[PDB]
């Protein structure tokens, strides 16, 4: 629970990680359970990630929603709605946490204690909001075998997203274009 303190080492050691990482793919499944513990969906989609700053967030069908990040933007692609929603990064982090994979943890470590415990195989990151201004409790990331793993945001009301990793391939080839998508004319375009 503790937001002051001196993670030094943690910080290097996450950015490390992530590091390894030029070029990601995965795909994940999530699943959230709202605060009252009465309201469970699951989703499945797929995650790109090509340094420095790209970063792709597909959400599959019902409900299809594709996030691209670039650099200090994010663009948030609703296809139901035919909507786009345009906003700067650390808006967007605590609906797509999934962004830390991309952030610069330089810049995000000003936003978040970082604490972590290592056994083996496996690193696992529990990182702390240092403003009690936000919507996160805690953001829980774990490395295997040196990979992306697992995901899971606690939210201040209770709300819990575990999101499970699999099929993470590292380092190889991604096009920029693979970081794009079709633009349907005149679709809805928005800022909140």
Same mark, same amino acid.
């Given at each position: 629970?503790? %937001?002051?303190?001196? #993670?030094?080492?943690?910080? =290097?050691?996450?950015?490390? $990680? *992530? ?66 929603? %345009?906003?700067?990064? #650390?808006?967007?982090?605590? =609906?797509?946490?999934?962004? $830390? *994979? ?75 274009? =693979? ?14």
């Amino acid at each position: 629970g503790s %937001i002051a303190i001196d #993670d030094s080492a943690a910080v =290097q050691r996450l950015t490390g $990680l *992530l590091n390894k990482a030029q070029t990601l793919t995965a795909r994940f499944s999530q699943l959230t359970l709202d605060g009252s513990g009465t309201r469970l969906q699951e989703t499945a989609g797929q995650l790109s990630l090509k340094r420095p700053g790209l970063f792709r967030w597909h959400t599959d069908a019902p409900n299809e929603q594709l996030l691209i990040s670039n650099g200090e933007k994010v663009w948030l692609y609703d296809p139901d709605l035919e909507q786009v929603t %345009i906003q700067k990064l #650390d808006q967007r982090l605590t =609906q797509t946490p999934a962004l $830390l *994979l991309s952030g610069d943890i330089s810049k995000i470590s000003e936003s978040f204690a970082i604490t972590y415990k290592e056994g083996g195989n496996v690193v696992d990151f529990v990182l702390k909001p240092k403003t009690k201004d936000t919507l996160f409790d805690t953001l829980r990331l774990s490395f295997r075998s040196g990979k992306v793993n697992d995901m899971q945001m606690i939210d201040g009301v209770g709300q819990r997203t575990n999101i499970l990793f699999f099929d993470v391939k590292m380092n190889e080839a991604l096009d920029a274009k =693979q970081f794009t998508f079709d633009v349907p004319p005149g679709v809805d375009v928005i800022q909140e």
